[PDB]
Ligand binder design. Structure first.
Ligand SMILES: *[C@@H]1O[C@H](CO)[C@@H](O[C@@H]2O[C@H](CO)[C@@H](O[C@@H]3O[C@H](CO)[C@@H](O)[C@H](O[C@H]4O[C@H](CO)[C@@H](O)[C@H](O)[C@@H]4O)[C@@H]3O)[C@H](O)[C@H]2NC(C)=O)[C@H](O)[C@H]1NC(C)=O
Ligand SMILES: *[C@@H]1O[C@H](CO)[C@@H](O[C@@H]2O[C@H](CO)[C@@H](O[C@@H]3O[C@H](CO)[C@@H](O)[C@H](O)[C@@H]3O)[C@H](O)[C@H]2NC(C)=O)[C@H](O)[C@H]1NC(C)=O
Ligand SMILES: *[C@@H]1O[C@H](CO)[C@@H](O[C@@H]2O[C@H](CO)[C@@H](O[C@@H]3O[C@H](CO)[C@@H](O)[C@H](O)[C@@H]3O)[C@H](O)[C@H]2NC(C)=O)[C@H](O)[C@H]1NC(C)=O
Ligand SMILES: *[C@@H]1O[C@H](CO)[C@@H](O[C@@H]2O[C@H](CO)[C@@H](O[C@@H]3O[C@H](CO)[C@@H](O)[C@H](O)[C@@H]3O)[C@H](O)[C@H]2NC(C)=O)[C@H](O)[C@H]1NC(C)=O
Ligand SMILES: *[C@@H]1O[C@H](CO)[C@@H](O[C@@H]2O[C@H](CO)[C@@H](O)[C@H](O)[C@H]2NC(C)=O)[C@H](O)[C@H]1NC(C)=O
Ligand SMILES: *[C@@H]1O[C@H](CO)[C@@H](O[C@@H]2O[C@H](CO)[C@@H](O)[C@H](O)[C@H]2NC(C)=O)[C@H](O)[C@H]1NC(C)=O
Ligand SMILES: *[C@@H]1O[C@H](CO)[C@@H](O[C@@H]2O[C@H](CO)[C@@H](O)[C@H](O)[C@H]2NC(C)=O)[C@H](O)[C@H]1NC(C)=O
Ligand SMILES: *[C@@H]1O[C@H](CO)[C@@H](O[C@@H]2O[C@H](CO)[C@@H](O)[C@H](O)[C@H]2NC(C)=O)[C@H](O)[C@H]1NC(C)=O
Ligand SMILES: *[C@@H]1O[C@H](CO)[C@@H](O[C@@H]2O[C@H](CO)[C@@H](O)[C@H](O)[C@H]2NC(C)=O)[C@H](O)[C@H]1NC(C)=O
Ligand SMILES: *[C@@H]1O[C@H](CO)[C@@H](O[C@@H]2O[C@H](CO)[C@@H](O)[C@H](O)[C@H]2NC(C)=O)[C@H](O)[C@H]1NC(C)=O
Ligand SMILES: *[C@@H]1O[C@H](CO)[C@@H](O[C@@H]2O[C@H](CO)[C@@H](O)[C@H](O)[C@H]2NC(C)=O)[C@H](O)[C@H]1NC(C)=O
Ligand SMILES: *[C@@H]1O[C@H](CO)[C@@H](O[C@@H]2O[C@H](CO)[C@@H](O)[C@H](O)[C@H]2NC(C)=O)[C@H](O)[C@H]1NC(C)=O
Ligand SMILES: *[C@@H]1O[C@H](CO)[C@@H](O[C@@H]2O[C@H](CO)[C@@H](O)[C@H](O)[C@H]2NC(C)=O)[C@H](O)[C@H]1NC(C)=O
Ligand SMILES: *[C@@H]1O[C@H](CO)[C@@H](O)[C@H](O)[C@H]1NC(C)=O
Ligand SMILES: *[C@@H]1O[C@H](CO)[C@@H](O)[C@H](O)[C@H]1NC(C)=O
Ligand SMILES: *[C@@H]1O[C@H](CO)[C@@H](O)[C@H](O)[C@H]1NC(C)=O
Ligand SMILES: *[C@@H]1O[C@H](CO)[C@@H](O)[C@H](O)[C@H]1NC(C)=O
Ligand SMILES: *[C@@H]1O[C@H](CO)[C@@H](O)[C@H](O)[C@H]1NC(C)=O
Ligand SMILES: *[C@@H]1O[C@H](CO)[C@@H](O)[C@H](O)[C@H]1NC(C)=O
Ligand SMILES: *[C@@H]1O[C@H](CO)[C@@H](O)[C@H](O)[C@H]1NC(C)=O
Lengths: 439, 128, 128, 128
């Protein structure tokens, strides 16, 4: 005969979602709102356990995206402003030894310490910061008629310090260690961790930088390959190194704008003028797309001509690659990595443009002014991935064409959080036994 | 065998480690406020979830225990297995799905039929 | 008979439902902060009030129970009634007013005279 | 003898008052927010510290008690004293330093050797 018995502390679980913390070892990132990290994380193997994951219905990506954009807004509350920056601002061309009108020498009136005396000052501006209204030429600052401009305080570091997300009590994080995972389906190797591994919030577009490499092959993951309104994420098993420089060697000036406020402008040019660029090698690159073609050829079939082609239109944010090296924001033309067709010491210079009034999150009515930095920037990174998209249209099973995709920041992170799934512990449980309570 | 440990093992073993998992169940000033509440929203949560299980075991008479035994005859129609095909051959993670729909049928046949009945009989023996 | 249920019934009945009431004892970002604290000021309150009653019952020896019985002889001068005019004819809501002033006289005659005495005698029996 | 009371007295006395210390273990709107969190950071703290001791005593089998006794033979190499030079001649404040390094050696020799063993033997007697 059998009776009910009660067990408390039973290892069963459910799927759940929750607000994760931050943990790490005067930056806008980690040092402000995180806790000290675990010096010795554990990784418990769970033999015989088979779960099912789904990297596209995971909610760790979307609530991280919420918390990243909150940090850039709650940090800039105490960072001056630039309401008085708008002026008619007569301007000419810079006459230096210039290999090339993409840099201008403007001039404008501003208020001095006394708020009743005019002060005629000047500084440099990039071509993209200057708008013609209609003798000589009267220009307007960009994004005056839509938004309000806030200078990011030039004491705050932006350097991407890695983030470790840790679950609170009564929860657990699973991890799918095995390979050959197109984001869904089962998982034979599950473990249990306290904290996700190193996540570095790096806001790039069209090409993933400083990511995590793949295991053996190039892993291609997408929600559905026949669905054109979806992005394709490629992941490299070997890095391809890229070197962005600029011969700037610029100067920094400042203008007092009200009592206790300061605006940091660009001073003059001590040297010559040359454009920026970014070099990639034609051997590690040309024998990387061979690997991507090989995995693309597997989905679509055989005898599929695969073409690569550049971006077909949109905002500057989605048709260029945008870095952040040292505190400057680049916009490099990458239409030479993707110009290729595939059947059956030389490098590539990628030109680049720089803008100082930016809008990182593609929002309405927000802008920030990036302050200049002294010295020449030399930054080395390596590319671990591509975000592709496919053109729809006619039914010819002879050629497919892929372009660089973009338009969403929630793909830099879904590439990293495809390993985890947050569960919920339920300690109670009954089962029958041959045991009787004697009263 | 840390958190959740023997999650693959049979139910027959799996429960010699229950205490291992029982101990786991518990100038920028405006930014310093929001990110403080996000910690208290979780710390208060685990205290409520711990206390809403211990109460349930207080009302079942199994207070201050981890394994206990009741006085509720198991029904044949609650699963059609043997004594051994449940302990030696299934896991808890699978067994939780087996009788998931039958939970609150059991939890009423606990308390209102087990412990109210015995508690009334105790005062009879004291009055004797 | 939900919350507070049989509040009109005699004390004699009224207490076959104690577990029913025991389970009930537990860009605009600046506005999102104030109205978050107003929830935590209440959620933390019920956890303190639950725990300050269970401790009181731990120190009286009645831990993990709902009805218990002590070893404290009731005094004649604590009310001049019968055995039955209290249970069969009064309510708890009225009885609470009857001996309201005599509460902490009882709560001292619990613990310091009931449980300290028995706890010292237990170690005598172990030492035997 | 309020908080901490007989802190000078010998351990032999000192413990007839344990319940006395057990009951002690538990338009300017932006300024009204910061100074509200500084209260909740302390009120939530004492509730966690209370509950992380009661759990430890639940897993040692001494739930709902204040003095208890175990089934763990004291080792000779845990201190080289007598039965009486500890109780009648030392204080707890000094005794805490004496075996401070030997704490978690004892806490493992509790639970995993005391209560797991007895709990498995109980189901043998029920199965009989
Ligand atoms: C992807 O690659 C394609 C090439 O395969 C590229 O399309 C080309 O874009 C350029 C501009 O980016 C176009 O070039 C224009 O060509 C016209 C001739 O029709 C010229 O007259 C234009 O001159 C302009 O600029 C001058 C100063 O340099 C001005 O003085 C003048 O008044 C004009 O304003 C300009 O050079 C070109 O037509 C296309 N197409 C081809 C086949 O070249 C495309 O832009 C790339 N995608 C992205 C996002 O860059
Ligand atoms: C952009 O144009 C502005 C104004 O047109 C330049 O600023 C001016 O540069 C000239 C250089 O010929 C300065 O003239 C010299 O200045 C020194 C010290 O002021 C003086 O001793 C000399 O007699 C001569 O006047 C001038 O002062 C300076 N400022 C103004 C308000 O006119 C600026 O140099 C140009 N940008 C670059 C990058 O050169
Ligand atoms: C991808 O990852 C690499 C590795 O961190 C990044 O490279 C690092 O970039 C920073 C940018 O500030 C470099 O810092 C600078 O160093 C020079 C000389 O060391 C110094 O003069 C500056 O003051 C500044 O500290 C750093 O040297 C560099 N390399 C390392 C750490 O090995 C790269 O930036 C990442 N890519 C992106 C887009 O962030
Ligand atoms: C990103 O890079 C691509 C690749 O170089 C740029 O496309 C090239 O742009 C130049 C100038 O806009 C074109 O040069 C012109 O070509 C005509 C052809 O007759 C020639 O007559 C002119 O004298 C001039 O040399 C070039 O053809 C064009 N396309 C290529 C190389 O296929 C593109 O403009 C860049 N995108 C951005 C947004 O800067
Ligand atoms: C900067 O401020 C000066 C001084 O106010 C401006 O000079 C005036 O320019 C207008 C334009 O027609 C004339 O009508 C005034 O007579 C000028 N006043 C003086 C005292 O010179 C100047 O226009 C402002 N802007 C720039 C770009 O220089
Ligand atoms: C803010 O000012 C800019 C100035 O360039 C406006 O941009 C131009 O607006 C006109 C009118 O719609 C268009 O015909 C032009 O094509 C725009 N661009 C350029 C380069 O001239 C912008 O529209 C203004 N913002 C708003 C909300 O009206
Ligand atoms: C960038 O420009 C600055 C000047 O603003 C250069 O600073 C000079 O550095 C050299 C040594 O390399 C010193 O001897 C000079 O005295 C410095 N000048 C000043 C005004 O301080 C700096 O070297 C430049 N960096 C380069 C060339 O990349
Ligand atoms: C970037 O790649 C280019 C492509 O060859 C390199 O090119 C030349 O290098 C020599 C040696 O310094 C220079 O004299 C030429 O002016 C360079 N030409 C161009 C177009 O850059 C270049 O050195 C590479 N630089 C970096 C920093 O990677
Ligand atoms: C990107 O930058 C790296 C780092 O400088 C370059 O790698 C070096 O290139 C030089 C060539 O002058 C070699 O002598 C070194 O052995 C390389 N390695 C290191 C670790 O310094 C690489 O060539 C650059 N890629 C380009 C220019 O496309
Ligand atoms: C993109 O592809 C086109 C097509 O091959 C390239 O155009 C030819 O480029 C070579 C060398 O760059 C020239 O000698 C030819 O004259 C070009 N074709 C014509 C019709 O003029 C183009 O160079 C490629 N661009 C990149 C960046 O790879
Ligand atoms: C995981 O599953 C395997 C299944 O092979 C278990 O290993 C053996 O399973 C057989 C039949 O189910 C038993 O007779 C053996 O006693 C099991 N153990 C050994 C050591 O052979 C295994 O016990 C399961 N659990 C874990 C944690 O590995
Ligand atoms: C509410 O009060 C009424 C009073 O009439 C109670 O009803 C009866 O009261 C008499 C005398 O007090 C008892 O002898 C009966 O047993 C009571 N019950 C019935 C059904 O007649 C009643 O019990 C009280 N409580 C409720 C919940 O109605
Ligand atoms: C504080 O220490 C004193 C030490 O004198 C204790 O007083 C006496 O100590 C001797 C020897 O240690 C004992 O034999 C006596 O029984 C102690 N008591 C009295 C009343 O003489 C004293 O007990 C200690 N504690 C307190 C709270 O005073
Ligand atoms: C100055 O720049 C404008 C546009 O950048 C150009 O139209 C003009 O020809 C330039 N003049 C000189 C003298 O360089
Ligand atoms: C690029 O790759 C293809 C295939 O490997 C090769 O035929 C072609 O010559 C390569 N081009 C360069 C410039 O290396
Ligand atoms: C596609 O080509 C590959 C070449 O390695 C071959 O192994 C595979 O069988 C082909 N598939 C079909 C359907 O022809
Ligand atoms: C990728 O880049 C980082 C930083 O630039 C470098 O340390 C690393 O060696 C590179 N290669 C890898 C990880 O294969
Ligand atoms: C067993 O369960 C069925 C339905 O689940 C129920 O009708 C029956 O009364 C139960 N048996 C006993 C003895 O209670
Ligand atoms: C009963 O209470 C009175 C006063 O309330 C008290 O003086 C008396 O000692 C009590 N009786 C007993 C037996 O304790
Ligand atoms: C007493 O302690 C020593 C070391 O602390 C240990 O080696 C010994 O086994 C213990 N004695 C017993 C009976 O366990």
């Amino acid at each position: 005969n059998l009776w009910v018995t009660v067990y408390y502390g039973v290892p069963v679980w459910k799927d759940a979602e929750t607000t994760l913390f931050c943990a790490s070892d005067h930056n806008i990132w980690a040092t402000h709102a995180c806790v000290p990290t675990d010096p010795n994380p554990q990784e418990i193997h769970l033999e015989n356990v088979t779960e099912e994951f789904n990297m596209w219905k995971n909610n760790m990506v979307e609530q991280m995206h919420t918390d990243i954009i909150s940090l850039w807004d709650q940090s800039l509350k105490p960072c001056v402003k630039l309401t008085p920056l708008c002026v008619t601002l007569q301007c000419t061309n810079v006459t230096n030894a210039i290999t090339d009108g993409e840099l201008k020498n403007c001039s404008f009136n501003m208020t001095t310490e006394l708020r009743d005396k005019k002060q005629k000052v000047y500084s440099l501006f990039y071509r993209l910061d200057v708008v013609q209204i209609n003798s000589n030429k009267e220009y307007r600052l960009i994004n005056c008629n839509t938004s309000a401009i806030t200078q990011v305080c030039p004491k705050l570091s932006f350097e991407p310090i890695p983030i470790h997300y840790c679950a609170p009590a009564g929860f657990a994080i699973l991890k799918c260690k095995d390979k050959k995972f197109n984001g869904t389906g089962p998982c034979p190797s599950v473990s249990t961790v306290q904290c996700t591994h190193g996540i570095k919030p790096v806001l790039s577009t069209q090409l993933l930088l400083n990511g995590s490499l793949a295991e053996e092959e190039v892993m291609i993951r997408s929600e559905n390959i026949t669905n054109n309104a979806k992005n394709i994420l490629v992941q490299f098993n070997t890095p391809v190194q890229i070197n962005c420089t600029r011969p700037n060697n610029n100067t920094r000036k400042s203008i007092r704008i009200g009592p206790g406020q300061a605006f940091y402008a660009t001073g003059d040019i001590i040297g010559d003028i040359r454009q920026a660029h970014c070099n990639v090698s034609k051997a590690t690159w040309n024998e990387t797309l061979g690997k991507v073609v090989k995995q693309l050829r597997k989905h679509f079939g055989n005898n599929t001509i695969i073409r690569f082609a550049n971006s077909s239109g949109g905002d500057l944010e989605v048709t260029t690659h945008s870095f952040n090296c040292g505190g400057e924001f680049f916009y490099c033309n990458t239409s030479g990595l993707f110009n290729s067709t595939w059947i059956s010491n030389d490098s590539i210079t990628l030109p680049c443009r720089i803008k100082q009034i930016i809008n990182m999150w593609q929002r309405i009515g927000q802008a920030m002014y990036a302050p200049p930095i002294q010295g020449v920037i030399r930054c080395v990174s390596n590319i671990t991935g591509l975000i592709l998209t496919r053109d729809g249209g006619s039914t010819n099973s002879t050629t497919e064409t892929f372009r660089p995709g973009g338009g969403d920041m929630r793909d830099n992170w879904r590439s990293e959080l495809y390993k985890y799934k947050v569960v919920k512990i339920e300690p109670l449980g009954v089962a029958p036994t041959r045991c009787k309570r004697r009263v | 065998l840390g958190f959740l440990g023997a999650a693959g093992s049979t139910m027959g073993a799996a429960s010699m480690t229950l205490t291992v998992q029982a101990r786991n169940l518990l100038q920028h000033l405006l930014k310093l406020t929001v990110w403080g509440i996000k910690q208290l929203q979780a710390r208060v949560l685990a205290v409520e979830r711990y206390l809403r299980d211990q109460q349930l075991l207080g009302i079942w008479g199994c207070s201050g225990k981890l394994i206990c035994c009741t006085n509720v005859p198991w029904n044949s129609s609650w699963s059609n297995r043997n004594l051994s095909e449940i302990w030696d051959n299934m896991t808890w993670l699978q067994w939780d799905k087996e009788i998931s729909n039958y939970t609150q049928i059991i939890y009423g046949l606990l308390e209102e039929s087990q412990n109210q009945q015995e508690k009334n009989e105790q005062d009879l023996l004291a009055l004797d």
